[PDB]
Design a protein around this nucleic acid. Sequence first.
DNA 1: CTTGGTTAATAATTCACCAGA
DNA 2: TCTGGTGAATTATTAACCAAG
Lengths: 170, 173
Amino acid sequence: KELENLSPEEAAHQKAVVETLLQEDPWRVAKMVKSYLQQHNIPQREVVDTTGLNQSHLSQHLNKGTPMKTQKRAALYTWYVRKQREVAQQFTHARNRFKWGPASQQILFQAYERQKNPSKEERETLVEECNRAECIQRGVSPSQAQGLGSNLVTEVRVYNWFANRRKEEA
Amino acid sequence: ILKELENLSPEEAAHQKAVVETLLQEDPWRVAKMVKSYLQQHNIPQREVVDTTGLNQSHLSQHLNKGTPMKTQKRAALYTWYVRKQREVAQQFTHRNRFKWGPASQQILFQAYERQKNPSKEERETLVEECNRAECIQRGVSPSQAQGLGSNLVTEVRVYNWFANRRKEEAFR
DNA sequence: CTTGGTTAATAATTCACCAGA
DNA sequence: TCTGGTGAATTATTAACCAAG
């Protein structure tokens, strides 16, 4: 079961962390929040949907060094620190639209450069070849940590990454 | 309250039905490029099209900027809109939509800035008219005193926010 | 299956807009 | 004479179906 996602002493840590970041340099902290969001391909939307921060604003702050009031940044830094409810999910092999991580794509291109063939066999030869990459890229790495949740490479996807790439070239 | 007392002309419409009827045979993409260049030049919000072409924003874009296949009926709504749109040639003649900076105006504003960020209202309303020139010129009809740029007509306030923004554009890099 | 068509979503961008010093 | 902060709006880009050879 779950009985850990809430510890006062532990939480204190979360909180204490936010006040170290809200004292650090915003853009330094920002590009940290970005890198994570990147590494873990987390829908920008998921953040907004919860911090109540303005999409345009957030984007502008994470990609451009646009000024964000402390209280706001507090909202972000928190969500960020509390988000590691995600490692608990990659630690226990036990919505959001799927997103192709750069890692999986760099290879998705192979089969294409090699042979745009959609073989439901030489597909898996990449499905777990992507997921192994996705898992690697984002800290963890057990070929089996299924904590990829919604970003997990599947054939309800790979087949499409080829399909689409097809409808492209002329 | 400008007039268009021929707006509903027999021949006039007849010709419209024929041209869309033509492009509809022409290469779908060559037409797009055409529709795109018009939209670009006159800096028309893609959105204005979508609202009245009942076409899918994503779709309209993909077709116009990429080689995305669109079935006839829609591409029909497009052209029809396109040719009907070329009505506003009246607006530029007979001397509600978010404003936008055409390239010609912008390439000119960078100087008035890289030169010296001087936002002197003495120099602002000087620029408004200089860009407002390029705009008309870039888009044929050059009757400067023909506020035909309508929603896209450069104003003192714009150049302000522009300069303002560009300055504040110099943040964490 | 897959290619013509098509889009709900997501997010970068653009242009503003406002509070004070 | 703006400038930190902010955001409603617009649009390129995503990852999808879906009908039908």
